[PDB]
Amino acid sequence: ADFKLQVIIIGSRGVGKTSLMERFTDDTFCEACKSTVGVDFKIKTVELRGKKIRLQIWDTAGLERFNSITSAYYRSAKGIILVYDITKKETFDDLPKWMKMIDKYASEDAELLLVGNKLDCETDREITRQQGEKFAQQITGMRFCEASAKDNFNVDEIFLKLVDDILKKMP
Amino acid sequence: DEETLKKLIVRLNNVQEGKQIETLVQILEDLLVFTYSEHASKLFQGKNIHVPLLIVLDSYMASVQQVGWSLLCKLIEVCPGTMQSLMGGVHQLILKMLTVHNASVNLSVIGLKTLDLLLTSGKITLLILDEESDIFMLIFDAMHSFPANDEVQKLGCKALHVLFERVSEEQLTEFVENKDYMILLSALTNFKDEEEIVLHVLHCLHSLAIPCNNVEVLMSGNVRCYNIVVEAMKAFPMSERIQEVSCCLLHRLTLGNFFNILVLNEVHEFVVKAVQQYPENAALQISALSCLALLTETIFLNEDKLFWLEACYKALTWHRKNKHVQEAACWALNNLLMYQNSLHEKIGDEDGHFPAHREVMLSMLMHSSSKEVFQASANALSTLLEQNVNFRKILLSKGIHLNVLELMQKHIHSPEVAESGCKMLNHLFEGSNTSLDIMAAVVPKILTVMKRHETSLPVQLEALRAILHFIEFHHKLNM
Numbered sequence: 349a350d351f352k353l354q355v356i357i358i359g360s361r362g363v364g365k366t367s368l369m370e371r372f373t374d375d376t377f378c379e380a381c382k383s384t385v386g387v388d389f390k391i392k393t394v395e396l397r398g399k400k401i402r403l404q405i406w407d408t409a410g411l412e413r414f415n416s417i418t419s420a421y422y423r424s425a426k427g428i429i430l431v432y433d434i435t436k437k438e439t440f441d442d443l444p445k446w447m448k449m450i451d452k453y454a455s456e457d458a459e460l461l462l463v464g465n466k467l468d469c470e471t472d473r474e475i476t477r478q479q480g481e482k483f484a485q486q487i488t489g490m491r492f493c494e495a496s497a498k499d500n501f502n503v504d505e506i507f508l509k510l511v512d513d514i515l516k517k518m519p
Numbered sequence: 520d521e522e523t524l525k526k527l528i529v530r531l532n533n534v535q536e537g538k539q540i541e542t543l544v545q546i547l548e549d550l551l552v553f554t555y556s557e558h559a560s561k562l563f564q565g566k567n568i569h570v571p572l573l574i575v576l577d578s579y580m581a582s583v584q585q586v587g588w589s590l591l592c593k594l595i596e597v598c599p600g601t602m603q604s605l606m607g608g609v610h611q612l613i614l615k616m617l618t619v620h621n622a623s624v625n626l627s628v629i630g631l632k633t634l635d636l637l638l639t640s641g642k643i644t645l646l647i648l649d650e651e652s653d654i655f656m657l658i659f660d661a662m663h664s665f666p667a668n669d670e671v672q673k674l675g676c677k678a679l680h681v682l683f684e685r686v687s688e689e690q691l692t693e694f695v696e697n698k699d700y701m702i703l704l705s706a707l708t709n710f711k712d713e714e715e716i717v718l719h720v721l722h723c724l725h726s727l728a729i730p731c732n733n734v735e736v737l738m739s740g741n742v743r744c745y746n747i748v749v750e751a752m753k754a755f756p757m758s759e760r761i762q763e764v765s766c767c768l769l770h771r772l773t774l775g776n777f778f779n780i781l782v783l784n785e786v787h788e789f790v791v792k793a794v795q796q797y798p799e800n801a802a803l804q805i806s807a808l809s810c811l812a813l814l815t816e817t818i819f820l821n822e823d824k825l826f827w828l829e830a831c832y833k834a835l836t837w838h839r840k841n842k843h844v845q846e847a848a849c850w851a852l853n854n855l856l857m858y859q860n861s862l863h864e865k866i867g868d869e870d871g872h873f874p875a876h877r878e879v880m881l882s883m884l885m886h887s888s889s890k891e892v893f894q895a896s897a898n899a900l901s902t903l904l905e906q907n908v909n910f911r912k913i914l915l916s917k918g919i920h921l922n923v924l925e926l927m928q929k930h931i932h933s934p935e936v937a938e939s940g941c942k943m944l945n946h947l948f949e950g951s952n953t954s955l956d957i958m959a960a961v962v963p964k965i966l967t968v969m970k971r972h973e974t975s976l977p978v979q980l981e982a983l984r985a986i987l988h989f990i991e992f993h994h995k996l997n998m
């Protein structure tokens with residue numbers, strides 16, 4: 349245990365934040381994933397870049413009611429992950445509000461990554477594939493990398509690329 | 520009679536045939552449970568003959584080791600002096616006896632039974648721990664290999680409950696390396712309806728939530744310590760042991776992550792029931808009232824008010840001689856009144872209302888010798904005065920100002936008590952008269968408490984607020 353992080357996962361409900369956190373940390377999956385009643389850890393130990401990394405994954409609610417409580421944790425987050433489901437368009441159009449909360453609460457060393465979940469319905473995807481980086485044409489830290497939890501496609505790519513992008517910068 | 524036992528000792532002392540011996544001591548087992556007398560009072564057996572007969576004559580054997588390690592446990596109960604002679608050996612032997620016989624659900628129950636009857640002494644736990652065996656590996660292997668056996672899971676767990684209390688502060692943090700968590704937690708799942716297994720599992724989880732890199736892993740979402748709630752709700756609604764242990768664990772868990780506990784509503788709705796149902800087990804009070812004094816900002820940021828206050832008054836009244844009960848209870852009363860203004864109207868000297876201000880007054884005046892109780896008591900009499908203009912007329916007449924100034928001057932070498940007592944003296948006087956003897960007695964003491972802590976930002980803020988109340992007759996005021 350050489351370093352501790354605080355990577356948080358934020359996004360409007362129904363997209364699959366808990367499913368991505370589970371696919372990375374413990375690889376389990378049930379189709380009736382009960383919605384997170386608040387915030388919740390899922391601690392992880394990853395060994396990379398010649399260091400042991402104690403990664404803490406704060407899974408958040410997504411409702412409008414808990415939007416205050418989650419606001420307490422945007423400060424310490426070394427890397428923030430924002431998610432939108434490609435089958436519902438309004439689950440992407442929420443993103444101005446999430447970006448407003450990020451720009452209000454986050455820190456200066458907070459890398460902000462966007463992730464599109466549930467890619468196995470790309471043929472039914474009501475949101476396109478080009479729109480991601482087109483929205484990420486804002487502040488240059490905003491990456492974009494679509495993935496899919498239930499089929500385990502580019503899942504750990506998200507977290508591993510994120511922790512590399514984090515610890516390649518700070519001393 | 521005794522000459523039969525002499526023949527038995529003479530037979531067991533000389534090994535000639537490897538199979539006949541297992542009869543003789545077996546008959547002794549009958550005389551072990553034959554309660555006609557304490558004929559095993561000679562102290563020659565069971566400590567100097569039976570241990571060499573038990574380790575040498577059959578180390579690997581289930582021939583003799585089973586009935587031998589059964590005779591030892593049947594002896595330790597009846598003949599008491601063996602408990603003094605087993606150590607001061609039997610501890611290097613039992614680790615090998617568990618190691619070799621790693622594959623018998625009927626020869627490991629007796630080993631763990633001698634362990635759970637043997638570790639109650641002390642000074643043998645230390646000698647077992649300092650060895651090459653690493654007994655935790657043995658008990659955890661015996662628990663791993665044998666699900667569904669009700670006695671390896673218990674007689675284990677009860678042998679960890681007494682072994683985790685004195686291990687380390689780093690081996691404990693190691694056992695959270697994906698070990699303790701699986702064996703201990705799982706037993707909770709298979710035997711969720713048996714009492715003693717659940718009580719000892721709650722104890723063991725309570726005994727490795729001591730570090731700070733461990734409360735994270737326990738409150739996490741991979742081994743979620745909300746098994747405390749299900750244990751306090753189903754397997755023991757009306758038994759004080761599991762309630763007390765569960766609630767002390769829940770007090771230990773409340774580190775800087777409150778909004779997991781209070782949001783999961785069943786972890787602040789159940790602790791209150793544990794307080795109100797059992798007002799006579801002081802450990803339950805010093806756990807639960809402290810836990811709810813911590814969690815009250817979150818439980819009132821999200822009736823529900825009336826929960827604590829009757830229990831806090833009952834805790835103040837009954838456990839008078841204790842200091843921790845009164846500290847935690849007036850802490851919870853203060854932190855309840857400061858975050859719910861309405862029941863300020865429900866705490867008064869009149870009929871129906873609770874006279875808790877007198878109780879906090881007497882609870883400060885008794886326990887003069889402790890800084891923590893005066894700290895929390897001045898914080899609990901501050902809030903009880905700033906929202907009322909009738910409680911600052913009884914205490915002003917009973918003589919609490921001289922008492923609190925003597926208390927401050929006795930604890931002159933601490934800034935906490937000076938700050939809290941000065942806040943009490945500031946809130947107590949506001950909007951009253953000052954008969955010049957009062958000022959001439961007080962103001963030197965506040966100036967003494969003002970030039971002995973000349974760094975703390977609130978001990979001069981409260982002081983240069985409190986002295987503002989006091990600043991023939993002219994031939995006295997000039998003096």
Ligand SMILES: Nc1nc2c(ncn2[C@@H]2O[C@H](COP(=O)(O)OP(=O)(O)NP(=O)(O)O)[C@@H](O)[C@H]2O)c(=O)[nH]1
Nearest residue numbers: 361362363364365366379381383384466496497498
């Ligand atoms: N096929 C498929 N289904 C998915 C995928 N991700 C999520 N789902 C489905 O969508 C459901 C949405 O539930 P959930 O994962 O909790 O979404 P959420 O937004 O994280 N809920 P909350 O944030 O409130 O906890 C899941 O239960 C699962 O059935 C995916 O990649 N592929």
Ligand SMILES: [Mg+2]
Nearest residue numbers: 365366383384
């Ligand atoms: Mg979810």
